[model samples]
Target: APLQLGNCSVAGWILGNPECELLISRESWSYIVEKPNPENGTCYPGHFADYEELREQLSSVSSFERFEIFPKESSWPNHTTTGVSASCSHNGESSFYKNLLWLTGKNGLYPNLSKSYANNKEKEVLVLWGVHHPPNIGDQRALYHTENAYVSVVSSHYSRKFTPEIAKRPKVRDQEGRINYYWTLLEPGDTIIFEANGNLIAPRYAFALSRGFG
Candidate 1:
C-alpha cells in the first residue's frame, strides 16, 4: 500500500487555498476583517473547536466544497424557475446565516461579557479577530430595507406572484434588479474559512484533529 497522511473532512481539506471574496451583498465588497491564510507552509491542517458550532451550519448550505484547498465556496444560486412563490433553502446566504444566528444569538452583536469569557482564557499576546455576517454583510441594502415579499418572489424567481406592495422595498432598486434577492427568517450563513491564504499559516488536517476532542 501507499503512504497515507490525511482522511475525510473540512480540515480534510488537504491543500489550503483561497476561500473566496466577501461581499457586502453581491454588489458591495469589503475586506475589513482581513481574510486569514498561510505563508511557506500555507496548506496544512488547522482546526478549531466546535464550541462555535460553525462547522455544522456551513456543511448544511455550502454550494461547492471539497476536502481540499479551503473546501468550499459560497453561493447565491439562481432559481431555475420564474414561478415566484418558491421558498427554498437554495438561498445559501439566507439559509446559512439563519442557522448561524442561533449559535451566537446576540442580535448579531459580539458576545456580551466577552471580556470575562476571555479574561483568564486568553493571553495578551494572542491575536484575535472576530467576524460578523450581518452589517458586515447584513448591511446589504435589500437585506434590511427590502420587503420579504419581494425577496420571496425575486429570491427564487418565487413566482410571478408579484403584488404592488411587494414591488416597493429595499431602498436601493438597481441592486435588486440583478439575480433577485433573499430574506431568510431567523436568518443566514457563509463567508469565512480557517483556510490558508494571507499571513496566517494553515496546516492541512481534518476536523477531528482540529478539535481537541482527543
Candidate 2:
C-alpha cells in the first residue's frame, strides 16, 4: 500500500536520525482588538493564539526575524467608508500596504486568508485579514463626528446580513440617498488559511507560521 498521510499531516522522506517525525497539533483560536466593545473588537481567529502571540513566535524564528518585516501601523483605510471608523490592523511601515476585506460568502478568496495546494507542501502560514463588523462599533464615529443617522440605518441593514459576494455586487443605496456600507463579526471556529510554496525547517519554522495579520 502507498504511504498514507492524514489531514493537517505532512510526510516526506529525508535521511535523518530515527523518530524524525513532526506532528503539528491544531488549536482553536480567536482574536480581539481589546478596544472596548466586543462588537467593535476586531475579532478573528488566531487559530491557536492572537496576533501578538503569533508575533512573538515569529520573532523567535530566523527567516522572519532577519527579514525585518514586522507590522507597523496599518494605512489601508477603506476611504469609501465614513471617516476612519473602519480601523485597520496596520496602516503601513516602510512598505506599501493595501486594505483587504473578507466577509462571509462574498469574501471567499481574499476573506481573512487563502490556502492553495500549489502554494505549500505542508500548509504552513495562516492569515487573518479583515476589518471590524458593524463598521463603526461603539458608534465611535457618531460620538466623534457629526450626526449621520441615515448612514447607520443604511449600514445596519446591509451589514446585519452580509456575505463575501457583496463586495462584487453593485453599491446599495436607500431611499434617502444614503449609501449602504456594511461589515460583519467573525465568530469562534472561523478561520482563514494562507499557504505559500515553501518547506518549514524545524526550529526556524514556527516563526513563519502566524495569525491575525493581513
Candidate 3:
C-alpha cells in the first residue's frame, strides 16, 4: 500500500530530551496529518524490517520517519481491508520500531488541517501518533474517529511515573528517548519544536532494541 501523511506517514515529533524520567517531565506534543486513505486502519506491524522495506520502496527516509511503530492490538475490524495480519505483541519495553522513507512532495509543516499559521506556534516538530483504543481515535479521511482516550501533557521539573492517576482521564504523552508519539493532520511549511531537545536526530526501533538485548 502507498503511504500518505494522515493515511500512512503522519506528522513528526521532536523529543525534548534524548533521555529523561517518566511521568514528571513529559515531552511536549504537536500533531499533524498528511493525505487520507480508505484502508487507514491497516496495521503496519512487526519490527523495522517491514518499515525498512516499505520506506525503501517509498524512497522518503528520515530520522523521525524510520521509527514507524504500532500497537500489537488488532481485532476483526482491522483484518480485511486494513492489511495488518500481525502486530508486535511484546510487553514491557519492546514497543519501538523503525522504517525508511523518501519525500515525494515538498516538506510543509502546517499544524493541524489549516492552510496558514492560525495558532502562531510555528516553531514545532510535527508528529504522527497512532491511537488504537477505538471511538477515541479519529479518521478525517474515510475514518473520522479517535479510537482511544484523550491526550494531554503537563510540564514539570521533577520526573514522575506514567501512572493510572495521570492517564486516568485521557493522556498520550511522550517522555525523552523512551517514547516517540504523535497525532495527525498537518501540512507543509510548519514547524514543531521540542522545548527540551532539538534537531533531526535518527531514532532506533524501540521494539528492535528491546529484543536485541535478549
Candidate 4:
C-alpha cells in the first residue's frame, strides 16, 4: 500500500533509506504561467517569466520557502487537484537539506544528484525532480519554481480520492482545455511505486526513482 501524505508517513523518506533522492536534468526547465483573476482567483492567459527571473527566484528566499513556492495566495487550499500539498513537514528535513546541499554544490547540481542515484542502485529509493507540466489553455508560458523537498515511503498501489465537497478550481491544463477541479478536502491511502519514468508531477518537484525522481 502507498503511504498517505495527510498522515505521518512523510517522515518515511530519508537519505540513508536507500530509496530516496532527487533526479535533476541538463535539459533547460520549461513551464507556463498566467495572471490570476482577482474576482475568483482564476488564472488568465499571460506570459512566462524570464529565464533570468526564474534563476533569480531559485536563488532567492521566495524559491526556498513553502508559502511562496506553493503560492497559497492564489491556490484553493492546502491540497491542489494535482495532488500537491501546500503544507510543509519537518520530518524529512535531513534528506531534504542533504539534497539541498548537494544541489547547491558548486561542482554541478544535476550531475552530482544523478550520480548518487545511479551508484545507490542496490538500495530502493524514490527520486524527485523539478518539472513544469507543459501548458495548454490560458498562458503558453512556463513557470519554473521549487518547493520544500520531502519524502514519503508508500506502496505501489496507494489510493487517493476527493472529498464530497467540490470546488471549481483551475489546474494546469494540458493541450486540451480541461480543468481538473480541486476539492475542499481530499483523502489518501498508500500512494505510489516508481516503476515507470516520470509517473508523478507535482508543484515544485515531480516524482520518479529509477531516473532519479526527476
- Highest TM-score against the true fold, candidate: 2
Q: Per-prediction count of colliding residue pairs?
A: 30, 15, 54, 20
lDDT of 4 by residue, 1-214 (tens): 1111121112112111222222322122233222232111111111222333432322212111111112232322222222221112125432222111111212211111111112112222233222223233222111111222222222444323211111233443212222121111011222332221111122232222221222
- Candidate 3 global TM-score: 0.19
Model 3 worst lDDT window (10 residues): 205-214
Candidate 3 lDDT tens digits, 32-144 = 22444422222222112134343332233221222222222221122121211122112323222222110011122112121112112222222332222211212111132
The TM-score values for the models, in the order shown, are 0.16, 0.23, 0.19, 0.19
Between prediction 1 and prediction 4, the one with superior lDDT is 4
The TM-score, computed over Cα atoms with residue i paired to residue i, of candidate 2 is 0.23
By TM-score: ranked, best first: 2, 3, 4, 1
Q: Write the per-residue lDDT of candidate 2 for residues 1-214, one digit (tens) a residue.
A: 1122121111110111112222421232232112222221221111121434433433322221111111222211211112221122223311111222221111112112223111122223322222222223233232212122111111111222112111122222111111122222122233322321111010101212333432
Off by over 4 Å in 3: 1-95, 99-126, 129-181, 196-214
For model 2, how many clashes?
Answer: 15
The whole-model lDDT of each prediction reads 0.20, 0.21, 0.22, 0.22
TM-score computed on alpha carbons, candidate 1: 0.16
Model 2: how far is 144 from its true place, Å?
25
Model 2 lDDT at residue 138: 34
Candidate with more favorable, higher TM-score: 1 or 4: 4
